[PDB]
């Protein structure tokens, strides 16, 4: 967690699958004995059949919620004007061209990057369904126009292989969207893309300004969400080395636009975390240096302009407080309220074998008050109406005993609950 941050959600993500896998098998050991124990024709009920179904219908959940579990993961969603460079940042993130990022190129729809085990990429398009591959970024890009259907409300997924990205195999998603000018009806996308977003990045054009059609976006974003994790990219950061005469300046002026937009406007931050948040950079230039290091060459052959490291440290500063963001932050979202409600479930299976416990208890205490009472009734058969009423009693102290131990063993899944809530589920 110290290594890669994301590391911190893939741990969690396993944690919290085994726990709600041995809650199953207790769920599943409890039916079983309620199951077995309501089929006693030798005793008065001890316990009742909406226990029964209510510990079946249990299970059931359970293994639905496993389902959801498996498939949790992290989202980071990327808006801005055109050509301000979102998909230069999402393939620089990747050290890979995985989405068209190219001049005279403009990307018309969602494409959403997501890892894949598998050993080459491919294309599902949502709501057509429909399987395509992309082994090259102009396979995909002859994809995305021959594809007439695709508008500023579809998404693309594009699945790329594993191997290649730690942020992919690290259960993290990327999506990519339209400019952000291309409509008005953005309530649309934040329904559609946006709800489940862990981190949300506004990629600049830091030779302008920030746009208004970006800032509207994001206070729309601040409406939906409770404290979302919001970051700004000041791209194309390398401009400012052909204006040396204004480029500090400048700097400083878009630096308390951008806190001044994230503190007291959205009110997300607070003012000493901004510079946690806000990035001059060069996107292209990480995209081409990451490119020529991957295949083996110096990272310098990315530069565009004077200054190359100074904006490279400041990408891979951006980067790492995203990674330390977004992991703990997507833990705590997508994993609370299934914590919870495993916590209500063993409980209520709790409850259940307590029920029995004290049911079958007090069945027993009737029963040793029986056996004492013969002595007043019978002489000449006491021994065995006493032997009888002995085995009557054992098999309630065995379900009395039994039940006792399943429900110490919800206990056990309670304890581990709030061990998984004490690591990974504490506000920040
Ligand atoms: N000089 C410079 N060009 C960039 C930078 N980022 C992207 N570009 C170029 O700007 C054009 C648009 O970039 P793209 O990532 O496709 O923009 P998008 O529409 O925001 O996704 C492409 O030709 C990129 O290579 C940058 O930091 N500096």
Not at 260 to 280: C, H, K, N
Request: proline fraction near 2%; glycine fraction near 4%; hydrophobic fraction near 40%.
């Amino acid at each position: 967690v110290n290594a890669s941050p994301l590391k911190h959600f893939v741990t969690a993500k396993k944690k919290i699958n085994g726990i709600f896998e041995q809650l199953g098998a207790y769920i599943q050991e409890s039916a079983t004995f309620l199951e077995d124990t309501y089929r006693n024709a030798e005793l008065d009920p001890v316990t009742t059949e909406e226990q029964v179904l209510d510990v079946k219908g249990y299970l059931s959940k359970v293994r639905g919620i496993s389902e959801v579990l498996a498939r949790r993961h992290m989202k980071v969603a990327f808006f801005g004007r055109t050509s301000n460079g979102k998909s230069t940042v999402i393939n620089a993130m990747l050290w890979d061209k995985v989405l068209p990022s190219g001049i005279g190129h403009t990307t018309n729809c969602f494409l959403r990057v997501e890892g894949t085990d598998g050993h080459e990429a491919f294309l599902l398009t949502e709501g057509s369904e429909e399987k395509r591959s992309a082994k090259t970024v102009n396979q995909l890009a002859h994809a995305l126009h021959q594809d007439k259907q695709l508008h500023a409300g579809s998404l693309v997924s594009v699945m790329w292989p594993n191997s290649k990205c730690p942020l992919l195999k690290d259960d993290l998603v990327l999506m990519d969207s339209p400019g952000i000018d291309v409509t008005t009806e953005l309530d649309s996308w934040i329904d559609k893309f946006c709800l489940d977003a862990d981190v949300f990045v506004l990629v600049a054009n830091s030779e302008s300004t920030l746009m208004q059609t970006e800032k509207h976006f994001f206070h729309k974003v601040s409406e939906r969400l409770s404290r979302p994790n919001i970051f700004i990219l000041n791209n194309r950061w390398d401009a400012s080395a052909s204006e040396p005469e204004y480029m500090e300046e400048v700097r400083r002026q878009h630096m308390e636009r951008c806190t001044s937009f994230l503190v007291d406007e959205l009110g997300v931050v607070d003012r000493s975390q901004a510079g946690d948040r806000i990035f001059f950079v060069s996107a292209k230039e990480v995209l081409n240096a990451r490119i020529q290091k991957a295949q083996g060459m110096p990272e310098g052959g990315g530069a565009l302009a004077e200054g190359f490291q100074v904006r490279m440290f400041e990408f891979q500063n951006f980067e790492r407080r995203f990674e330390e963001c977004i992991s703990q932050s997507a833990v705590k979202t997508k994993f609370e309220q299934h914590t919870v409600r495993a916590k209500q479930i063993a409980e209520a299976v709790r409850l259940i074998m307590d029920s029995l416990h004290m049911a079958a208890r007090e069945q027993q205490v009737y029963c040793e008050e029986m056996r004492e009472e013969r002595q007043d009734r019978t002489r000449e058969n006491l021994e065995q109406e006493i032997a009888a009423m002995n085995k009557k009693i054992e098999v309630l102290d065995s379900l009395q005993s039994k039940a006792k131990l399943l429900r110490n063993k919800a206990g056990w899944l309670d304890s581990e609950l709030n061990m998984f809530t004490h690591q990974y589920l504490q506000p920040s």
